[PDB]
């Protein structure tokens, strides 16, 4: 009897979504002048990693970098003189994600060891030490994002997400509802909500204090690999293995527009937005990062220069540089 | 160099020391043989680990090499989302229990055959050698003196004895390779045995030798 009620509720939600969308975003943006050809250049190339690079994150000063590779090393970059600030060894070399604290005093890492590790960067001893060892996930850590100091939001492969208190080291809120392995995270600009991408072609919006799933977004045909919020916080873009980027609307709760091309058949590893949100950068498996017009669904540039799978993407907070990490153990800063 | 202040020069020197330490760490890491350890839960994985939460890593050195055997059976999630992490391991050690042909989890032996097919034909391990371990010789002999292999494979036709049945299972497992010329598969029968370490050592030595030859274009 409950299955019939759930089906009726799903049909009602679908009908309510269908009783909307008087026009598409393409029709509205047809009056907008398209952006011309956009050609970034490899200003800096970062070397020192000897294995596949799976994660990077930009600092709040738009200058410091962190990169995670299968070397078991966490490297802090200067990105201006290509100097290495810190090299943090990892007890587990199977790292899959890394996060840089907004205050800049901490860095995070995690992966196949099911443990998110928090490291202290600014200590009296002058070296990077392990501050806390956050255990409690039964699956591999796929993404971690620092809400602020003493609070970390992590997603794991056991179809759940957890909000931790770093001082106590215990989970404060557990986010459940996904059926597949959650592989992505992105926080709102005000750190008020966040969205997750699981291996079930669905995305869910979560409330940090409430712990409840506000809205669920579908439409993808494969596993969602990366999600990134719009700069204004009212939208987000999802990348999946079906060679399709989709933009979702939080206030409207429908699929808004699709970023796809016939010549692309490979999966998408990372997505990112420009400072104004006009450019949607997406890293693919065809060794190239494609620049997408976020309003007109038109490819405006290609970041060719990586000879392996581009697994990482990142835009500085001032939106002036783009750093791409790939499996060829090279980081390239574009501008 | 002449346009750099003193602090910038000292930071550059620190970065160079970091570079040299990374090079030393990579050199030390390149002298360790990484090994995936796969197979069904019912297979004799435990005795293979006994040969001496998340990924379990094991160290052991036979003669002149250091081995890194990684267990992935503790993660009950989607394999394709993290199997690419192991691309570049010297070999994949696959354990199959010969006594599971007549059980069920849906035959267990055909379950392992599908798992072996999925691992072997995966795109991340196109040239990765597979060391296939066939466990429980004596239990298989006990179960084969009273029951045939026909209940497992109806097309099988042979006199019920250990040798031909073991050879037939081995050849069916080897025939799942769809790249026989480039990929090579080692097969070994084990039970109270102490020769597993020698077999793994020999298989790893070949793979290293064949990779050296494929990076030289000799053959």
């Amino acid at each position, epitope marked *: 009897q409950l299955r019939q009620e759930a089906e009726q509720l799903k049909n009602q939600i679908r009908d309510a979504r269908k009783a909307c969308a008087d026009a598409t975003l393409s029709q509205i943006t047809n009056n907008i002048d398209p952006v011309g050809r956009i050609q970034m250049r490899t200003r800096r190339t970062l070397r020192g990693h000897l294995a596949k690079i799976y994660a990077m994150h930009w600092g709040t000063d738009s*200058r*410091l970098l962190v990169s995670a590779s299968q070397d078991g090393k966490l490297i802090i970059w200067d990105s201006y003189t290509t100097n290495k600030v810190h090299a943090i060894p990892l007890r587990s070399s199977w790292v899959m994600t890394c996060a840089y604290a907004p205050s*800049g005093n901490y860095v995070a890492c995690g992966g196949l060891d099911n443990i998110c590790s928090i490291y202290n960067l*600014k200590t009296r001893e*002058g*070296n990077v030490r392990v501050s806390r060892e956050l255990a409690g996930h039964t699956g591999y850590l796929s993404c971690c994002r620092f809400l602020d100091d003493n609070q970390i939001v992590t997603s794991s492969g056991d179809t759940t997400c957890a909000l931790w208190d770093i001082e106590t080291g215990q989970q404060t809120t557990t986010f459940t509802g996904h059926t597949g392995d959650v592989m992505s995270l992105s926080l709102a600009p005000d750190t008020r909500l966040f969205v997750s991408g699981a291996c079930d072609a669905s995305a869910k919006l979560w409330d940090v204090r409430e712990g409840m799933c506000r809205q669920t977004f579908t439409g993808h045909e494969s596993d969602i690999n990366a999600i990134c919020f719009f700069p204004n916080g009212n939208a987000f873009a999802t990348g999946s293995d079906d060679a399709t980027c989709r933009l979702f609307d939080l206030r409207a709760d429908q699929e808004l527009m699709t970023y796809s091309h016939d010549n692309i058949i490979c999966g998408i590893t990372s997505v990112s937005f420009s400072k104004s949100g006009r450019l949607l950068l997406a890293g693919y498996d065809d060794f190239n990062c494609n620049v997408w017009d976020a309003l007109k669904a038109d490819r405006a540039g290609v970041l060719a220069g990586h000879d392996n799978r581009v697994s990482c993407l990142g835009v500085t907070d001032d939106g002036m540089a783009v750093a791409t990490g790939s499996w060829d153990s090279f980081l390239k800063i574009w501008n | 160099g002449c346009t750099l202040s*003193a602090e910038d020069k*000292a930071a550059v*020197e620190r970065s160079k020391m970091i570079d040299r330490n990374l090079r030393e760490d990579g050199e030390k890491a390149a002298r360790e043989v990484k090994l995936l350890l796969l197979g069904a839960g019912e297979s004799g994985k435990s005795t293979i680990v006994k040969q001496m939460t998340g990924i379990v890593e094991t160290h052991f050195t036979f003669k002149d090499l250091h081995f890194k055997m990684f267990d992935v059976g503790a993660q009950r999630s989607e394999r394709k989302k993290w199997i690419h992490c192991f691309e570049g391991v010297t070999a994949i050690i696959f354990c199959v229990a010969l006594s599971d042909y007549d059980l069920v989890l849906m035959n267990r032996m055909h379950e392992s055959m599908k798992l072996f097919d999925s691992i072997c034909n995966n795109k991340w391990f196109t040239d990765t050698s597979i060391i296939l371990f066939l466990n429980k010789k004596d239990l298989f002999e006990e179960k084969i003196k009273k029951s045939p292999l026909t209940i497992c494979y109806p097309e099988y036709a042979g006199s019920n004895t250990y040798e031909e049945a073991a050879a037939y299972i081995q050849c069916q497992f080897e025939d799942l390779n769809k790249r026989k010329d480039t990929k090579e598969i080692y097969t070994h029968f084990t039970c109270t045995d102490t020769e597993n370490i020698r077999f793994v050592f020999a298989a790893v030595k070949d793979t290293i030798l064949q990779l050296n030859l494929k990076e030289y274009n000799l053959v």
Partner: single-chain antibody
Framework: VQLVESGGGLVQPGGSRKLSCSASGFAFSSFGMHWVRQAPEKGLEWVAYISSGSGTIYYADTVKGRFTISRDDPKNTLFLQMTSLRSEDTAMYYC??????????????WGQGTTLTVSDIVMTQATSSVPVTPGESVSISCRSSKSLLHSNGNTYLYWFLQRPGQSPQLLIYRMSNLASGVPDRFSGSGSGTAFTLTISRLEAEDVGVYYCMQHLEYPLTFGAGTKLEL
């Protein structure tokens, strides 16, 4: 974080002495090390420097070819191999912990210091003694003969506090950044050659001699030292 020195004492002129410090509580191998000399007339003077890895060694143009600085990272120890000591070397030597990266604090910790007794950018401080009262706001100015603003945008200016009977400690590094462990009451400002250090309120622990240092280029030169009386 502790630096303890030994080896000082009375030495005949023209002889030799062997100073050393014992590092404890920090990763000594990752820190550059300086030797700073303070004469009995209360004047700081940089002497030598060794990098985190040996291979970058500098000396002031008064002891070069006469002083030898070495680092033994296994034992966490510095060394000064001083030869042919003269009467001008009678002073107190300090070892200064130092690190260099983006956002680092290169002059954080100083040693206790041992008294040794033997039987360039010019930084000027206008006032050598400013008698003031607690609870008021004061300003101390330092002037540089050459502009300290580099093309990177940084201004390598350092402020130090030396209480009577105590070792100097860092207050402001790069003219605008508060050191770790000091309150936000201290503030620093300047542009190019003119510099000013501002204090909101004076306490009993703020009485001492304030020093002014530049790190634009070697040799490192200290200021004359402004003493606050209250």
């Amino acid at each position: 974080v502790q630096l303890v020195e030994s080896g000082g004492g009375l030495v005949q002129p023209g002889g030799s002495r062997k100073l050393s410090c014992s590092a404890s509580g920090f990763a000594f191998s990752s820190f550059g090390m300086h030797w700073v000399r303070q004469a009995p007339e209360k004047g700081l003077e940089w002497v030598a420097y060794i990098s985190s890895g040996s291979g970058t060694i500098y000396y002031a143009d008064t002891v070069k070819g006469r002083f030898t600085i070495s680092r033994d990272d296994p034992k966490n120890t510095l060394f000064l191999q001083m030869t042919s000591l003269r009467s001008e070397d009678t002073a107190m030597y300090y070892c200064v912990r130092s690190i260099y990266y983006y956002g680092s604090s290169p002059f954080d910790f100083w040693g206790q210091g041992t008294t040794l007794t033997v039987s360039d950018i010019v930084m000027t401080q206008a006032t050598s003694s400013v008698p003031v009262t607690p609870g008021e706001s004061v300003s101390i100015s330092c002037r540089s003969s050459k502009s300290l603003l580099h093309s990177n945008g940084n201004t390598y200016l350092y402020w130090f506090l030396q209480r009577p009977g105590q070792s100097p400690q860092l207050l402001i590094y790069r003219m605008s950044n508060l050191a770790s462990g000091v309150p936000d009451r201290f503030s620093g400002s300047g542009s190019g050659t003119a510099f000013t250090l501002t204090i909101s309120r004076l306490e009993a622990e703020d009485v001492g001699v304030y020093y002014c240092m530049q790190h634009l280029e070697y040799p490192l030169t200290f200021g004359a030292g402004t003493k606050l009386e209250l």
